[PDB]
Amino acid sequence: MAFNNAVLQEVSDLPAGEVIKASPHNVSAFEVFQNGLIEGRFVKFDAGSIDILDASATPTIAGIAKRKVTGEIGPGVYSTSGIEIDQVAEVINFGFATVTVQDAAAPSKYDPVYAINLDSAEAGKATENSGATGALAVADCVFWEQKAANVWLVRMNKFL
């Protein structure tokens, strides 16, 4: 159908899955990954492949799925075997990066980031509330500032 949101009230800030390159930053390419890897989410590393967060024991959070500016137009999705095939999964593991947050979450600066660990659409979403279902403490990462609607720029103190 027509273009969504003809006129927006404010200019939306950084979309999720984006890394600021003024600060020190590292986005590292993983060749093997999971089809349908949502961008702008925390992604885990399992069996030598970058895949979506899902209920597990203690997933190895490898960082934030980088949003490709020159990727396919559509939902933020990493795809294999299509016209929109993405050869590698670009993952932001160091620096300031934008991640979607649970719509219930209301975080603030220097709050410890919690990723979502569920087999649902909310997989890989950040949050401040640790009592949220499937709240996984991401090691050494803090919310920095609210960029967009339900998107927060967080800071990964060390590599993820």
Binding site: M1, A2, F3, N4, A6, V7
Partner: protein
Amino acid sequence: AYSSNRRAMQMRIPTPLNVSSVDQRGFKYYVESYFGVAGLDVIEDTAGRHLTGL
């Protein structure tokens, strides 16, 4: 009540009316004319509004 701005909606007429060359079979002349239309391409949804049953 709508907006006529080009960025709000357009009338896409991809192939404007073109008339075929006149065919003459003996003394029977025949022409076709086709035009290809996308129609009203409404670029943005809220670029108009309705009032029904006036």
